[model samples]
Target: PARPAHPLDPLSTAEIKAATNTVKSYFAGKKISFNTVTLREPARKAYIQWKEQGGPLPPRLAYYVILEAGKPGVKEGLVDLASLSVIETRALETVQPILTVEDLCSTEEVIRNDPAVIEQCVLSGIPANEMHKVYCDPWTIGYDERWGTGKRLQQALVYYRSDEDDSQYSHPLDFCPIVDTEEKKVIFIDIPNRRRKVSKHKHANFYPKHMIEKVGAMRPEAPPINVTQPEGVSFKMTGNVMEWSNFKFHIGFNYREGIVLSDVSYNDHGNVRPIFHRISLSEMIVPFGSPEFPHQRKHALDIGEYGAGYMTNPLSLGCDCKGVIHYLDAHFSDRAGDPITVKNAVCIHEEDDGLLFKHSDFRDNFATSLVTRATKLVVSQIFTAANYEYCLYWVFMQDGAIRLDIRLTGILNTYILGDDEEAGPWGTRVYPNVNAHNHQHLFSLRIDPRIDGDGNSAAACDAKSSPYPLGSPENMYGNAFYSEKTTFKTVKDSLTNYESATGRSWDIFNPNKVNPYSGKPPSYKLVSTQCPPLLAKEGSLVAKRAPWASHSVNVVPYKDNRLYPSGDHVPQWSGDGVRGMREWIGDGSENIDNTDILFFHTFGITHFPAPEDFPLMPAEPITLMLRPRHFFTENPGLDIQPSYAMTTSEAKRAV
Candidate 1:
């Protein structure tokens, strides 16, 4: 009667070819594809500014996914290390193995037929292990795991290649390699400084040459980057520190906790060092007293900008939320082991759209004035710079979207591949693959939108936030933003089926009365000039291959901020999602900082317990767009549709 267990009788194709050939034998050769990566031209110019405004991008966003240990099944929804009774997991180590939510089941006839693995296991449950096959791209992953509870820190990026005859493996980009997981191996760091040749493997820890030339004559690291007591001896600071005269200066701190800003005291090869970007005061939080957020929360804590993963955890932003609920109620009433489930924090959704204030008393007086200005900017950047006499306690939550949530979380670092064409078909050349098993785990980052700005509510509440008091520019593109547009009839049958398929002039669907963002034309249109007669229309609406989202949604914004020891600026603060439209809004120099933009709508209900992650493995695709590149210069969809040929009185006025 073992017939009682059937989540598709545990994945078979000989269990994904022996877990994709032992997770592709640790990076054999490399290059698994995706346009040889140069950040794909600013990720296709932030995906053409999220498709010219009207955003919500995720058609595929899996960043760095690796799994296969005792290769069973599970990865459904996320954080399901074989459901050993959820305590807090993303399967950090045992070599970052990951895959549990009961091994993400898959039977029931491979879930009634695989249409691109059933449309990415229904939009993001599982689909990204590139070299090991099972495709579809769109990605995101900002590593380091600490504060949600630490110890998953192996900074990743693996790569390999070697079989000979000039061996570069059959072109998956010449053996795509980059895995470095804290020197576990697989590196080539970009190879091509004239044919390339620089080796170091054997678990690296190389110093001495006068301590590596005293870390190359030091002095080069600065920002609003801070750090407290990352378990002692870790103080990397920067808030743009380069002052020049008035007593010459330039600062940046944080090192140890397995260091790496390319580590060598932030510089090892060549001279181009200093580019550690991170910002996560929970990505510019503000569901509390936001006039679009009065002067960006004390201008992101006095340009000592908070969140290198929340200062990388000096007991994480400790503002003493009732002395952390009375030290977790006296450490769980004299604790024993596993029972930490405190819950109740909420503040991620958003409100207070009415300009002035009062969304529940301005989010409870901005969560008590953002825990008294983020605990006096983390006690003047970690115990008054270092007088040591300190005091701060944090129990937090700010959540997502308009709410301005800032609990602090960030991550990115996973690269494994040391040989065999970078391991694909499993490691199958593992440059950046992980879906049908064989994991390099998906590490993605492409939703730029000129820098993620541009307020995309998609118009049509006719200038008033329209929750419907008889509203209707067809409600523009809200109701959680969903769309349906497919037709076989329009402008002489869609221009006679686009001149019998691709002969030109579909004019990207014409219209241009001009309006790149207020030039006029397109405040609202689509079955309306003022229709009254019978008519209507409207719409709206990641993780792992399940087993609890194939490792509970990662890329932790850079490991829950360890007092900005230089890491966490939400990956280099770049916004344009449109909202107030500040052009590329420059002037702060060194990576364009206009800041003020944070929205995450991540709705996590995680659950995945394998059998190859069950008749489940595809539900992680999170995308939000508003594309236009430089904001405008043509192609805003030419001012929102009026042609593309579909008329006969619009099909006999709908017959």
Candidate 2:
């Protein structure tokens, strides 16, 4: 593993090769295809002790999953890098490892060359000779009722491209095909009862070259505002850990979570105070609202299925992030049991955040005004899931606040629409003869809060009116209100959902560390207002697969290896079994009091497509924040020097 400098550092390229070879020797001369090889993170307790105290580093281990040539399912095992041997190995039949880029491409190839699929395409206005223009975006069958999880499958969303750089979604093929990944063949085809053949309209192109034909020449530019950091960046990185703006945390990347922030603390004057132990986007589901047969399988668990890190783009400097940026490369093992590296998988940079604080004295005629500009440290990554781009930015402010901004862009998942058919309630006509279904992007954010230390509790904070009527002393004018703080002592009480009516949010606080002035618990208040409820029914596949999305706030006892909310292997499971977040809840009786715990919160947007979103969808942002509430004695940013400040006494001297 090239000797990891820290316990949380990702496995190096050499370590991946060594781990793959160690597993190959485990089965002697048997042939096998590799699935994934990632770092098996150290136990939470051990990792904390090693980071906090002077405890020795934990054993470096790698987790791997592979399928033998003729095996029924995959074999998963752990290898100790120090010992250079497999510690444990097991074969599983009920689960499937995450689908890879190779799997997605393989399915596309299978459908493109298949005689039946080609015939179906030819029947839908596509010429047989123009096979090069046919393309498909494969997705997990979201637990199809027809075929259980017996065979790992991908449902092909077929499309046609007029040119090499054409946006294929404008002309979608009518028929959908099912592919058995293990067998590498198209097993079945689902043709709509009332098909809408391929679209004959002009391409809804987004490229500047083709777009000019329909939309006319580009508008004249006003000015260019470039981001330059001539003074260099302020963030200093040691190994995988980053120290920036008084915040210190380790950055860990893997196949699933693109960026895992761990051991996040702040340098409060001289005291290193712990806030959150770990934070990551555990899982996300994009559930389409159409009730049609084949479209029923449209729900995709992108993180758990294809993986955010594996699909992460090798970001460009000036195009991806503007200012002076630092990048961290990611490594993994491919299907051939060899090392694969994605350069610039993660970006860290600072952006001018406008105004931090501004004040002026009216008596001084606004002359003695004070202004403090803000700068935010951003850690981001962009990954594509089929037709959509998920851009995640983790921003840290100087005022001890964290913001998660997810921008949805790229092409829409479109289907062919008949000329005579109505747009319908389930979808919209994003382009001529193209329909985009209504969908919700539900994301589960797993936060392990340490608050001031380890002893912490979670509570739902709601703004409630006084029970007293207008005549009462408490509410003389019927305008009295206060925060109704309800603490979650047990899992049953903590399985809470967002209530927009009450202006609700959750707080993770430490009772042991009370604010001296407010007499309130020191905590981080989650102010996530853009939460969209999962539109799928209670027993629906999407609902069952991601129980973490069922509620806005879910608190569970701290445990290792529970990062994935849709279970570790999420490619084809039926969601029929208790898995992931469901397994952790366990009847909702676990105590989540002032002890070690992790809270799962769901936040996202419900998107209904419009014509403006066609060709290339503009970036739609969903923002949420975690701000310090009663945690700081005063404004933490007060320590930061003001951009420009003037006082009456100084103004008199200047005059």
Candidate 3:
């Protein structure tokens, strides 16, 4: 042979250069922001807690794979060959002739060209809103119960703007109890809706005349009302968490910060693949508790002021519906051990309701189904595939008035803490080894009181008369509203602002760079009597200068990134102005993933057996209609009075 080259390497200099350039070319357009990525402190703590508790297995992450075609096609409706008659067999010849391969276009072609095709395929043939997205994280689909004897109530206060200026008044009478059941009445919990002016330090409901006018219309001869004022619900804060009681629903806070759902990807059977255009935002959940708190209380003469003070503790009103689920195992321990199914007898009541966390999403079938199932468990109600009227009542009153006026604005999920290792200009860089963080879900509930009417029974309540957002932001309902949200921009900005306000350091996105905290980011400073940046928008309400209203509680550990702004490192949801809740660590994709195979089986993509899937349908979503009361006894027979002292031990009672 010829003289051999002394240097022989796996990659030649030319080949190495070509490969390096190719790799660089592929990533040239995908710029990950350096200021945006960081390990949320709360997320890290969640992982640690899980490790200590003999961590549970992690869930998988997957995306929807859609297929469609441009040309006309017939989705096969399966048939039993034996069932065909002689005439049918003869007809089959004609059917098969027209259904040739040439007449059909493969699914891949249609997804790219038609939006409708993509929607139909990915969401399944059943309407796009009906089929639910299964998350890879299972935690989102589970429930938590913390009540035993007495009652626990929570409040959430949200502030939005109106078109008019100097509008600082808000609707403060929206607190919820732990359960509204057949045994407990709705009129027992008495929370008031009160407003305070930061500028002049004046406090009032600003709706006395409206209240009297409402009484005049409901029962013109009831009587003239006069009361000095009502006390706003009192929330005791010890650390980062806050707590209140004797209201109605037991509202527990969870995940004050946001966590990352797994990185999801989809395959459309093409070189370009598929992209996610719009993922559904998280929905609002209605809570169930003693329903009597709105109308009946100590000040029965002045029904207007009963729930006024509740506005101060806005966290309670945020939960959509309050409820508690006691499986047959817990409810009837003495009975036979046979597991209870729908086929067997069961009982549920409306008065014995608990709390609901997700926002009300009647549009999403999957979401609606979940709500229906929860509601059925509480109310023992029946339903149809597409009917959700039970969940569609606006604000109803015991006086038989239904107000259909309501509007909801979208909220964003953002990062709140951790990710300190990775920081940059706006802290956009992802931190190395940092998977997720404890991020709070910050969203607002916008209600337009313009639809004020007494369901035709009573005269129309003036638009500006109701404490809703009709004329100005200040004169609107002033309670902290909570919601589950998922979005792109809002989630990003909320994190940035959280970092800025907390004065924390983080790492940047550049290959190897570190960023330090300069000062407070704008979002955390409790900025000038306006809604948080994550909640900024046109026509939002600027009710008062009081701090952001929140309730805090320690959730089941290791669920979400858990962190406390306290000296003692233990978990807590009370104290300071800081309110934190326990949440699952990145359960976003898991919930959707679990529902996929079930959906596939239901749609007949797979078949182990048909009869086994007899009730093979989606679950029902829980729904509720909150109404005002004339007396605490309106929901008679239902025990609206919660016995907290009976449930807690002496040690906790002392605190």
Candidate 4:
């Protein structure tokens, strides 16, 4: 019999090639040039049903192809087509295709990955020698509802390219490019020159020097080293499914959402228990805080526009990971449907975290102590979304804990200064006059939890202390503290704000099943931290585009085609987009109680540029961890033994 198929496996090389050929043949007579052909994810409703009830999966592909038509520099330069087609492959030399919506939207434009066209706009606008001093960074033109245009438009931020290769030098010129991918040219340029020059600073040359680094001096201590077994890793991978100790899960990639983890489960005693059906970074908005024309139009929904998965960085050995690391390859089709592999795109490894738990006692006759080390299973992927790079890490621990860490590190988006020091305080002065603009990185994660089973309820659990209840029967001493649980039944009821002072937390649990030991329901607690939300006006375009930002925790009933918070499309022309989180919670009356639900958790930083973040900034990690509340009967690591045991002499010396 054939082996069971991995539920989260990406499209195979053969499947991708077949899908490409089918699209080409279908539109052979048309004058169309293709841009990209990506493997679209199947509907959640269909996939969940099929996985629960074993059967052959329905193979489908969502091809994002750009067609060449109309004027090169006009609003109709290029059109985007999303072809939804099915692939039927059976027997030898027999295949079939069923196409749906060969052309989805004619107004759509291929915005990201058009750096060449952006450069052409600069060259055509100015002289040839001037092109050397000018560096072009392509930016996504967000939809302003007041623009009063239906056609999709794109613009580029022109910067002064200095001698030191610091490309973000400010030029005070923004170009509106009419890009034609088929003609390979920018036919027209519209430069909105808002000559807002702050001041000329020498710190604009942001590159770091190695020897003169004055942060800390070199130490005499030996270099840290990690040594592993000669035989290799202990984990085993069969297709996309990985099994390390008691942890088992399926890993895959999305064209927009980089690494996707599905069917995550851990062994409870001898029975396997489900944690989450799917977990992914749905959308991220990087909003700039400048009032200039081009800078004011600066906002990037990275995942929706650029597709983070397609921009996966190739990881190196000693740099990205360490210790018996295993690498997995990711496959995607080019514009022509030809297959390409990103080698070492995903890295899996185990890390030693000092001690798990230990205790020592000094008795009269003898001394005894128990100690154990903590080992964590980590899966990591890096995405270079234009200027900034993000490292996404998912960690699994032996104590039934799942931790997610996002590390933001890369070049800062900067601007050139004129001669005024008091002009731009919102930006940081790295050099003499170069100012790195202030911005906020708002990220949201779409989590489909299946704690224990599918029927789960969510609630906010907070531990609060009594405040001098002298006359009350509860607490006269004010030192007493108690925990309270507030269960939510509706979507609006579940919108939560975390209280750090009270040690507040959110939990998803199966209310029907009680913990055998605690006599309470088992839950997976999601700990929230102090991460700033969008500071934009409530009625602003950026706020409307990301309604999920208003609340720290958003709980909604799981429905088909509700994967993203910032809607299905990012470069919305009218500022009013469809399918976004705010649009998803349209009056907020959807039932979320004890049903299959999706939790939209937001975490981010309101970055005020500092001099220490010049050239390239260090990685700032924002972490969120999920731990078992009453899910575990006892300490799962109790059976673990210390690597080194105490000898008789060592015990005698302790006395």
Candidate 5:
């Protein structure tokens, strides 16, 4: 649990301070520019030993990444708080570390104050006197051939604002500026080959005042529907572990991954069975579908480049996460390596989930009925990266199923176009003189399944019909479909893709704990129907940088420091070398059968924007679930009593 602070707990404020102090003292003369300072969780073997075996509590450690003011490459340091000393340090060159809020914040000032950027604004219809009104959203130069990691750079997405509170997206500037963040100057402005003038339409704003100005008045409010728990919450928080229904798990938040779950288990009768050791969203990339000059640089790795936890939003009572909610704060470091707190970073609440199980008898006039309504526990966070909002909700159901729901909303990322020009095949004409390019939101979800114990095997289970003809002995009847499972024995064998032909799903089962009835190991099945193909071709920057997205399924032997599919450093990287996902999936000879393993699934949506998606986009959902199979001896949810239940005798009496 996190109260007493488990090994898996995010670094506390005081702990961060302690680690930062130790590093500062160690590097007194070095001009230290801090990037990230957070906890380095213990190894899986050590964590299990300390947690379950009641061994000596694992040593609490802090991991920090930094850069020297004038020096090149990244510096990683480890602090041993018990000893109050710097235990280890590594200096990595060529590879630029992930961009932080500190870096993202600095580029806008540089771009706005530059002479060349101002000149471009004037050419794009901005008055020379209104230079102050020009603004830029600085993003990591996804990939650049000219300067490729030779300098720390930011490609500024330019826009203009006539009024103080206008939506700048409605007036996008056609030129893109490449800013050298380290040198604090604009390197060059990549002008569009085919010039496009700014739009003449009003700002496509969504603010209350803007809405009122567009129309005459606001819509009437709906009837109030309060979600108050007068009787108090059903879940109990014993440290960081939230015990609800038959499930219990530790809720964790970090600088990169917004929400993480550890030691997820379900209490079956009196026995405590472990389902998963850990789970988190490791990586995501939004690759804009354009082959134009700098448009190819639009593939943004939102999670790795700008962290989910760092960009997460605070929630309100009746919004974000509706219901009686309990919130948790996340702590990380600033540029100076000082602790910064994001309040309400994770929202935990309960929601009415219709019916878990129901039955009705037509006999006796259908009076005999039973309906067991479900109340699901959800741990959620909303993170805004650039123009898009990704709301993630981890739902714990009473039926021992877990759902990972991602709700994508917010304003579309737009570029300018000449009012007379058609968007062509590359993008959509969302609004007058605004082009929204086609893109894919590919996400990597990592699962460390325990499945009742350790040493688990995985398989791609598919529904297959008999190969023989209908008139043959094997298939005398036409309807003879059965589940055909192909077990994963090696890493290469497990590195597979989704098969729509057979309705494929993957299973993670503990080989040690064989089920008594089915003669199968207890398992947790991952069912993902929203698996989108990676549109980027081989050898492209997106295809190389985010190898995890190329396939739907990938398995690797369990190892520490294997959390992120993209390497820890993801900015300004030209995917030329083997690292991250490729490193873990080496020639694929590692055995994955009945041993500790990590399962990864790539699933998300490919977005082609429409005019309706302008102003503001509605929340579109991409859902995947992890459910139990051959694990429970019987229905584990039979214990919760239904609100309505009657026998045939009682039904007859009522009629």
Candidate 6:
């Protein structure tokens, strides 16, 4: 198998360097600071044919280079083109830097890192001997309540370590510091009256030597189990393309979008049918709902603000994934255009989903049984944005179902309760004085669907319960329910919400092809397994910045450079630049029927932290599924034979 050319791959080391130098030379006398030099993905139409029909690989590398010029009130814009020629460039009113954990590490003074800070903290109330074990994590400060100014600030959550163990998070110090980044010093430290007490025993111990067990070890333990691959493997990987069962797709990585899966198709019978042209996570916004001065401005556009690719964690072999895992490395360039590689950034593996379906028939002194199973191709990547770690999973099942799962884990962004017992109702006192602020993690996934082929149509598939009297001939029974399919022809009709009352779902279907069995067009239906709406009131900065949060699903005509529901730069000072979803729909007048389109779906959890969230928080799973709706004549896995079975004669003979 040969390695296929990755369309979304970032610019190479040489290319990045050349592009940067070209931009600098083009600007000439202007003092410009480069932010990012990344690959501007070719239009979906441009590559769908190339990937499916195998003609040309589409024009190789086009770049989107962002830079800031002039002073304080910096003038910013994104430049386009190659090292030798400039295609185009445009200026923006303002641009914000993509903040990363690196920014916090550089700006926030850590007591563990700086001895002087530790000495100051010790004098400020911390025990002298415990100075070495002190650990501090960065927290994003919010703005004022109803109306306020837009300003960036930083704070830290102080915690103390019990022993040589690196679990200081288990012992939180009942205080916080407001650090002034420019001064490289703590402006002030707030010490609440009620100090959280740390347990003497429950230390985070991973080492075998320090292991202690009693009640749990004494109980009856489940035997060790293993998943074996006797037939070796089913999936064949050549370059980025993976073919398993009847599923085929190409996997790639991006600097902003973590995992990129392209040219996804399912081999229906003998004909290969295209499903999605390109699938990737577009942008995620985690807005902390707090209004106490600085804490109110706490909002992060994780992808646009801090690239998920940059924050991707190098996964471990046996820990992060099981079974025979295939690791893929991601290449990205820094602000200086120097290339860096993240090893094992993606893990591809197959997992068994217990049982797919089963049926048995017992008659005529003989019985026939059908026990089916599922094989899933998982492309997973973990990104740590500030205190939160998000595991983005793009899973493909053999039964023609695609699932997008998000597992949220990591330290909570906490604030001090000050001298009071509580920090109002907006936050929960997870620890004594540590108030874990209420927040919402909203993610907008840009799904580019090519069902069977491009120019697909979208509709809202809704189920309704009839309240009409049974006296009518159509409604003889007391209860009556029917399914209504509404075709979306315009942007206004496309922007929809999940109707829990009606059990609503959305479908993107191909009008040209119809299922022989159902006599209906084959389509992909999107069902929100878990979805929550924005709690922030409308017209607020957070709401205005991410209006896409108002609806669960949005479908619009595909356009070049319209990648995110919210524009490239998020955490906007006000809802000024980049129209985002609101502007894209613009008066709800665009025609979207039977044309190339993009679907934006939002799914996440609203966290109102509790006591159990302390020490380490558990992963709250958020998921959405895309399943076949009349896309297949029958269950795709119907023919799958039971891997383990015995005949009745053999069992009787053994007995």
By summed lDDT, which 10 consecutive residues of candidate 2 come out lowest? 316-325
Tens-digit lDDT track for model 3 on 208-253? 4544553563335667543221442233322212122211111111
| Cα lDDT, model 5, residue 362 | 89
What Cα-based lDDT does every candidate model obtain? 0.20, 0.88, 0.18, 0.66, 0.88, 0.70
lDDT of 5 by residue, 18-97 (tens): 88889989999988978899888888889888878987788888899988888777899799877878999988877687
Clashing pairs in 6: 142-294, 142-295, 142-296, 142-297, 142-298, 143-296, 143-297
Model 3, residue 575: displacement in angstroms?
7.3
Name the lDDT value of residue 263 in candidate 4. Answer: 84
Candidate 6 local Cα displacement, residue 442, angstroms: 1.7
Q: All predictions: root-mean-square deviation over Cα?
A: 27.6, 1.3, 34.4, 6.9, 1.6, 4.8
All candidates: TM-score: 0.19, 0.98, 0.17, 0.83, 0.98, 0.84
The lDDT-based order of candidates, best leading, equals 2, 5, 6, 4, 1, 3
Q: Give the clashing pairs for model 5.
A: 2-240
Better of 3 and 4 by TM-score: 4
Output the number of the lDDT-best candidate: 2
Residues 462-554, model 1: lDDT tens digits? 122335333456565544232222221211122111121221111111122344665532211111111111111111001101111121111
Q: How many clashing residue pairs are found in candidate 2?
A: 0
Tell me which residue pairs clash in candidate 2: none
In terms of lDDT, the poorest run of 10 residues in model 1 is: 33-42
539-582, model 2: which lDDT tens digit per residue?
A: 88888887788888889989888788788888767787787888
The lDDT, on a scale of 0 to 1, for candidate 1 is 0.20
